[model samples]
Target chain A: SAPILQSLLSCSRAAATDPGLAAAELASVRAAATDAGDPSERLAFYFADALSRRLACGASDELTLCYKTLNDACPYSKFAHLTANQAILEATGAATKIHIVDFGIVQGIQWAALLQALATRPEGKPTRIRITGVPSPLLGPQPAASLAATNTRLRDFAKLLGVDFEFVPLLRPVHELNKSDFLVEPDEAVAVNFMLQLYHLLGDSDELVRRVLRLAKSLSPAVVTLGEYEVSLNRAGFVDRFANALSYYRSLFESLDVAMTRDSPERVRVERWMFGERIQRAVGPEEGADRTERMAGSSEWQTLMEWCGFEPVPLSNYARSQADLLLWNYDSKYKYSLVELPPAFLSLAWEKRPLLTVSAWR
Target chain B: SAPILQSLLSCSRAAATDPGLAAAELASVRAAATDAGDPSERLAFYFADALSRRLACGASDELTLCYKTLNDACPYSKFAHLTANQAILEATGAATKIHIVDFGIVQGIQWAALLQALATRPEGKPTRIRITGVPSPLLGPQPAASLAATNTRLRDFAKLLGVDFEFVPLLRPVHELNKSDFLVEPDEAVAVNFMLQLYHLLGDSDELVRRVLRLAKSLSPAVVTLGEYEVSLNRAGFVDRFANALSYYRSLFESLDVAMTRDSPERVRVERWMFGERIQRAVGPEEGADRTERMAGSSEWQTLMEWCGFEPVPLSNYARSQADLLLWNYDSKYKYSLVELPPAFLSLAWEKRPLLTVSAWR
Candidate 1:
C-alpha cells in the first residue's frame, strides 16, 4: 500500500516536471483501491486517478451530480448554506426589495433556502427578491436548459411562499464582474454572496481575490457574505502542497465516515468526484485553470477582505442558535460544530477542524 | 496524500540503505490513516506501521491473540484445518493407532477439531493418538505453562471423544528435526500436517525446504498435508516485492470486509497484527529470521514435492462435499470458493483469487 502511494507521488512529480515522462511512469502505476477494499487504499486510488486526469487534461462532467450527493449525505454544505443565509437575512433586516449577487451560484439551492427564510421573516415577507447568479467560468456556462429549470423551481417555490422573485443568470467569472452588471435597484438592499466560491480566485498573489472583492464592494451592497474552505494549501513545492492537502482531506474523509457507512455509494461518489477533484487541483501543476483550488487560511482571507475596505460583521444571535439546531439533525457522532473564530467569523468544523468558514462583512 | 506515500517509501529505502538516515526520514513521515478515515487510508496506515516495525525491530506479543481473532472472523484457517483433517481421516481408515506430526502448532486448535471428527467417524474410533508438535523457532520457545495448557485441552477433548491421546512438544525448528524426534509406534499410521507452514524454511535456494521434505519422507508417513498461502511473493527488488504483496493483500483486505463490518475491532486486529506482519516480512529486508514469509506459487511447490519423492493424493469426494457445506454458512456475497487446480490441488479462493492452497501427498 505504501508502495502504491509512492508510485502515485512519483507519477505526480514526474507530471509536474515532464508530462511525457510522467505519462510513461503513470502507465506503470496500477493500484486497486477498490470500494470493497480498505479505506486507505480506496482514497489513495482516487488520489492517483485524480493525478492521472490532471496530467492528461481530462475531467468528468459528473462533479455537479457528486456534489449534490454529498449535500444529501453530509451536513457541512447545509450548515454553510443555512448559516450564511441567516447572516444575510439579519444583515438586510426589514428590507422590502432585496438583490443578491451570488458567486458560483451552481444550482441556486442556497438561494432557495434564503428565499424561504425571507418569506417567513417576522419583519414581514419581502415584496420582491432578485438573484443575479454567477456560475463557475471553468465549467463553461451553466447549461441554458438546467438554468431555466433551476430558475423556474426557485420562482415557483417563492410564489408558493407569497414572495415575488426573479432569477437572472450572469454567466461570467467573478473577477470580470462590474458594478453595472448587478443593476441594483435604488430601493433594493444588495447582498454579495461567495459560498465556497472565493477560493477559485486565489493565486500565488492575492490579486484576483482582491479584484473580485473590490468589485463586490463597488456594488454598494448592504451585506457581503464570504464562505470558503478554511485551508492553508498555497505552498511552494509539490511535496509541501501534497502534505498539506493530505492532512486537510484526511479530516474530510474521516468526517465522511461519521456521516455515512463505508459502503454508501453516495460517500464513494463524493470522495471520487468532488474531493478527488479538489485534491488534484491542489496538488497537480498550477497552470491557468488548473490552479483554481488555491485556498488560504481564514486569517489570510480576513486580512485580504479588510484590505479591500470591508468591515467584519458579527453573526446575529439567531443565526448562531439556528446553526446549532441545524447540527441537531445530524448524528452527534459526526461532531459538526459551529465555531466563532476571533473578531467575528463562523465556521462549520468537523472534529474540531474548521472546514467551511462563513463570515459577513460591509 | 501522494507526498505521504512518497515519504514512507523514501523512509523505507533509507532504512534499507542506512538506518540512521531512515530514522530521520521516518520522523518526517507522519500520516493519519485512521480507523475513522476512508478504507484506503486506514489500510495504508497499517502498511506504513508494518514498515516502521520492520525498520525499528519492534514487535508485539499479541500475535497469538490476533491469530485467534482472525480464525474466528474468517474461514481461511478453518477451511485449511477441516480439509486436512478430512484427508487424514480417509487416509488412516480403520487404523487403531495414529501418529500425527504437527508443524507450527501454536495452540493446537486444529487437533481439537480433528479429535471431534475422529470420535464420530463411521469407522471405529482410534484406540490411541499421539501428536508431535513443532512451533516456530523464531518465536523462541513456547512457554512451558502454555504448552501444558494446550496439551491438557487437546487431551481432555480427545478423552471426551473416548480415545486415548498423548502430545509431545518438539522444541526445535523443522530444519533441525530428525526421524527420531517423532518416536512413531510401529503399528501407528503416520500423518504429517503443515498447516500454513513450510514457507518459513524457504530461501533463495531450496536446500532448507528440500532437507525438511526429505526428513518427512524418511518418516514414511501415510499422508502429508500441505497448506500455505498461494502467492508468488519471492521477488528480487523492493518495488517488485512491495507490488506483489500489495496485490495479494488487497484481495485479503477485501475479503475481510465481506466477512466483517468495516468497524469491527477483530477485523482491525487481524489486518494490523496478522496480515500486517506478513506484509512486513515479505517486503522488509530478508535477514536471518526476517524472511519467514517468502512465498512461492503452488506450481513450484508441486515440482519441489515431486523431486522430494512424493505422489499427489487426491482429496476425497466427502471432503469436497463438506467444503461446499462449510461455505454455505457464510454469505454468498463473500465469494469464498473451493477450487480444484490441475493434478488434484484444493485451494480456498476469495473473489476467484486463490489465497490458501491445501494438498495431500503420499
Candidate 2:
C-alpha cells in the first residue's frame, strides 16, 4: 500500500510539474468563469485558491497535512456533515450491515472524511460497519510500524469523538486481486471507496473495469465512491496530456538519477516505464457514446454491480456532476478525466443530482 | 566522377522504389495542381515523367541512358532550349570565336544543343568555336577514349551536314580543380557552363560563390551558365529538399552497393556526403547582400557584362537577353537562377538566383 502511496505521490508530483497539467487547470478555471458568468479577474482568485489546494493536497505524502489543515480551517460543520450524512443514509438504506473497502488508503484522508460524516448521525440509528484498508507495497519496510502508528493516531482521534472505528488492513498487490477477494456474505451490503486510486490502476482501463465488475459481482457492493484527476477540458487528446506529464517526471527522475547514490540506469528506466508508459495505459481512449449509454455500457463498475445483482440507487447528484466538472478542471491542466459511477441501487430520475442506486434482494 | 554518377543513379533507383517517395510525388502533384496556375498540368507531366524515367532506369545503374532517353523524348526543346539560349546570350555578346567551357558534360547533351545553335545562327555570321569539356569525375574511366569517340562521331555528323566543328576534350577532375587552375589568358570570349553540377559541390553558398567568383575573375569569361533542380516546388525549404533528395539517392546507392561490383561503401558515402552536405556550399545564404544585389541589379546579359567590366555594347544585350530567356525557361521547371558568381561568393546572400552575369575585362 505504501508503494501505491509512493507511486501516487510520484504521479502527483509529475502532474504538478507538467505544463499540460497547468494548462488543463487554467482551462477549467476559464470554463468555470464562463459558466458562472463571472469576471475572469474575479474568478482568477478563486481559481488560484482552488488550484493551490489541489496541488498541495493531491500528493499522497501531503495528504495528512492537507487533511489536517483543511479540517482545522473548517470544522466539522454543515457542509462537511452533509457528505457524511449522505454516505450513511445510502449505506444504511442499502444494507443492514455495511462493509466499506478503501483501496490505496494513503494517510486515510477518506476515512477521516467519512468518520466526520457518520458522527453527525444519531447513535441508535447508525449502521453497523466493517472497514477494509488496502495499502501500497512500499509500506513493507515497516508495514507494522507505519500501520500501527496510523491506527494509533486514528484510534486516538476516534476516541475523542466516541465513534466506533474498525480498520482492518488488506495486504495484496492491487494488480493481483480480483473481485472475489473482497467478497462478504451475500446478505451483507458493501461500499467500495476509491479516492485518487482509480487513476493509478487505470493503466489498463479495460482490464481494470473487468476486475471492478468481477469484484462487484462477488461482493455486491451497494455503492462505489471514486475521486480522480479529471482532464476532459483540454481538447488535446489523452495521449498527449499523458505523455507531457510523463516527460516532466522523466526529466525529474533523470536529474535525481544523476544526484542519487543508489541510482542505476535500470532503476531510472523502470521508474520512467511506470510513470510514463503505465500512466498512458491507464488513460483509455475517449468514450464517444452519450452519457447514459457510456456509463452503462462501458463503465466496468456499473456493469459489474449490475452483474453482481445490486440495483443502482441515486444518492449524490454532485458525484455525477463532478465528473464533467473535474474533467474540465483537470483536463485543462493535466488532460485527464474524473468521473463517478452512476447510482447502482437508487434512482435519481426525479431529481437533478445523481442518486446512489440502492437495491437489495429480499 | 564514376563513383559520383553511380551514387546518383543508386539514389534515383531507391527514390523510385520508395513508397514514401511515390506518395510524396502524388502529394506534390495535388499541391501543384492546387497552387500553380495553367502550367500545373505540364509541371505534373514533367514530374511524372521524371519519376517514371528514374524508376525505369533503375536506381543501381548510371542514369545516362535514362537522361538520354528523356532528352530524346522531352529534349532541350521549346522552353528548355529557350532557357539555355537566354543564359548563353546573356553571358556572351553575339561574339565570334567563342571559347566555351562545359562542366559536368554528361553525355554532352547541352554541348550538342549549344553547338547546333551556334552552327544554325544567321548565315554569314562567323561562328568559329573552341569548346573545352569537363566530364564529371564519376564518369567511367577511359575519358580520352570517350573523347576521341565523341569527337569522331561529332565531326562525321557535322561533315555530313557540311558544317565546321571544333571540339576539344580536356580530361580534368572538376571536383579537384581550384579557381587558379582554371585561369585563362585573354584569347577569345569564354562562356563557362555548369549544368546540374553546382548543386553537387560541398560547402555553404558563400564558399560556392567565392569559388565561382575566383574562377570568374581568373577566366575573365564573358558568360557563366548554370542549371539545377528546383527543390521548392517539390519540397518545402532548401534544407528539406536537399534532405529528401539525399535520402532518395542514399537508398539508391545502398541498392547499387548490393547490385553493382563497381560500387563501394566508401564511394557511396562520399557521393552522399557530396550531395547531402556539399550542395549547400554552392548556394549563397539569403543574407548575402552582394549576391542579392547582383540578382536584383542585373536584368539582362548586358547588365552582367557591364558588371564584369565589359563596355556597354548592343551585341552584349543580345547575349544578356538570350541568357535571361534561357534561365526563365530553366526556372520554369528547375527554378535555377544565374548569378555572375556562385551564390556562395557573397557569404550572406545565399538564396538569390543570379542568371549568368557576363562581363569582360579589357
Candidate 3:
C-alpha cells in the first residue's frame, strides 16, 4: 500500500527532467489510479500522473507561454532592443553584412525585435542578416508562433532594411549541441542567441554542459548572447528545492496576484499549467528520467561558460536603461530589478526576487 | 482549464497541512478527475489530493509512533537518564522526597526511563515523584500507549523502592496551559519535565507562550528539564515553511533510508504515515481545521524561557558525555553531536545537523 505512493512520488520526480521519458511515468500513475480503490488513494496517483505529464512536455513550451504574458514586461525585449543597436555600433568600418545565430529560436520574437531596430536605424542593410536557429520540438506550428512563421515575419520586416535573412536551424537537443549546424556563412561578424535552452541542460551531465559550451566557443562568435530564467534553479537536494520553490513561486504568484486576484484567470494562465507543470516535475522526478527540469543559477551559468573558454561581456549602460524603460511601460505594481550577476548576467527580478536573466559570452 | 489544476494544486497543498481536511480536498479533486477526457488532467488531481491527505496529520503523532520504534534509541531516554540522576544529587540535605511536574506526558515513557534508573541506583530513598501530567488528545490510551498503562507500570516499579507515586493528570489541552493544573506543592524541590510539549504552542500567540512560561516560573522548580526536536519548526510563511520542511525531511528520510531499503516496510511504517502526516500538517491547513502542527527552533524555545524569567542552566559535560555514550551504543552508522547553541540549549545533532535538543532551566 505504502510502496505504491512511494513509487509514484519517486517516479514523478524522475519524470520531470528528461522530456523523452516523462510521458510514460505519468502513465504508470494512471494504471495505479485505476487499481486504487480508496478515493484518497486514487487521487494520489491522479496528481502524480498529471504533474508528470506536464513535466514531460519540456520547459520551452511553458516558457514560450510565459513570455507571451510578459510580452514587453521582461528584460528579454530590452536586451533585444539594446543588443541590436550595440551590435551595429560595434560593427567595423567597412563591414556591410552581419551573421547571427539565434540559438533556441522559441517562436522567433527576439529576432523580430532586433530586426525592427535594424530596420529603423540609420545604416540599414545591405546589412546582411544571416540567421541560424536552434530548433526545439516544444514549439507548435509557427504562423503566429513557429520558426517558419517567425522566418516569414522576419523576412517581411527585414525587407524594409534591405537585410538578407537566412534562418539556419540547429537540429539537435542542447545536450548534444553541435557547432557546424549554427555556423552560417562563417565570415564577417557573428552574434549568437540562446534563450530558454541552457535551463533544460542544467541537470545534464557535466560533460554535456561542457560540450554545449565548447561548441558555442568553436564558432568564434564576437558575442554569444544568452537569456535565461534567473531564479535559483540549480539546487539538486530535495529540501533546498522545496524551500526555493516556495520562495520563488510565492513571489511569482503574488506578483501576478497584484496584477489580478489569487484565483484570477491571468494568474491561472501562467501558474496553472505553465508553472504548475514544472512544480510537478521539480518535486516528483527521480534520477535517469527528467534532467531538463534542472535550471541553472546565473552563477552556475557563468561558471559553465568560463569553464569552456568564454569571457562574460558586460551589457552597456543603455541596455540597462532599456530594461528600465520596458518596466516603465507597465504599471508601478509590476516590479523588477535588472542587475548583472557577475560574468555579466542582466538578471531581472520582481520585488528583488529574480525571474529572468540575459548575458553575453565572447 | 488552468483553474482546475490550480485549485487542485491549491487544495492539495492545503490538504497536506491538515489531515482532517484532506478527505474533502480529495473529493473535490475526485469530482474533477472525471469531468475531463484528458487522461493526464484526471491523474494530476488524483495524486495531488492523496499526498496532501498524508500531509494533514500533525507531526507529533508520527514522532511519537516513530519514537515507539526508536525505543531505547531516542535521545529522550539519554537526557532523562542523565537529568534525573543529576536532579537527585542536587536535592538539599534531609530532603527525603522529590517532586516532578510532567507536562504533556505521552504515555509517560520518559518518566518510566527515569524511574527505572532511580530503582537501580544506590541510596535509593523513600522518594516521592508527584508527576502532574498536562494532557493532550493526541495521546491515545497509554495501556495501549495510553496514560493508565504507563501510570500502572510506574506505580509497580516504584513499589520496589517503597516510594510514593502520585500521577496526577492535568485535564487541559497544551494551548490552554494552566499553571494551576500542573503545579502541586510549591515548597518541595520541583524538577519539572517538559518533553515534546512546547512545540504545540509554536504558532500560538506570544501570549500563549508567555502564559505557559510564566506559569512554570510560578512553581519555583529547582530545575525545569526540557526536550524537543532540534529541527526548524518555527517558520510561519508558506515559502519559509515549505523550504524548511523539504530540507528537514530529506535529511531525515535519507537518514532512515540508510538503515532500511527505501520501500521496506520499516521505512514505510515510520515515514509513510508518520512523516506523511507531518508533511501534510507542515504544508497544510488554513484557519478552520487543524492547528496542532506548530514546531519551533531551539533558540525560539530559549527565548520563550528567558521571557518567562527562567535562566538557562547548562547541562553538565557528564550529561553531554552520557548523550555521546547513548549514540556509541548504536551501530557506527548512526552519527550525532552533543553541543550547545549559545544561551545554552544542549542540542543533539546527527552529522553536525542538530536533530533534537535537551536543556535545563532554573
> A-chain TM-score per prediction?
0.83, 0.46, 0.73
lDDT of 1 by residue, A207-255 (tens): 8888888889988888899888878876446656665666577678777
RMSD of candidate 2 to the truth, in angstroms, is 34.3
lDDT of 2 by residue, B1-362 (tens): 23333333343344635352455544444344311222223223233334444344442133433333233222222233334444564455456667777666654444544554454343222355566677654355656665676666555444433445577766755535665554444656777765555444422233544454456546766756544443321213333443443433333233233222332333333333432222322222332222121111222323333454545322232332233332321212243333344221110011243222222232
Q: Model 2 chain B, poorest ten-residue lDDT window? A: B342-351
Q: Which of 2 and 3 is ahead in TM-score?
A: 3
- Chain B, per-candidate TM-score: 0.83, 0.47, 0.73
Q: Indicate the residue-level lDDT of A147 in model 1.
A: 73
Chain B, candidate 2: TM? 0.47
Distance from true position, residue A49, model 1, in Å?
Answer: 5.6
Q: What is the interface RMSD of each candidate, in Å?
A: 32.3, 46.5, 39.2
The native-contact fractions of the candidates, in order shown, are 0.00, 0.00, 0.00
Question: DockQ of each model against the real complex?
Answer: 0.01, 0.00, 0.01
Order of candidates by TM-score, top first? Answer: 1, 3, 2
For candidate 3, give the lDDT of residue A315.
Answer: 68
Candidate No. with top TM-score: 1
Q: Which stretches of candidate 2 lie over 4 Å from their true place?
A: A1-362, B1-61, B72-82, B89-94, B141-144, B158-164, B175-187, B204-209, B232-362
TM-score of each: 0.45, 0.28, 0.40
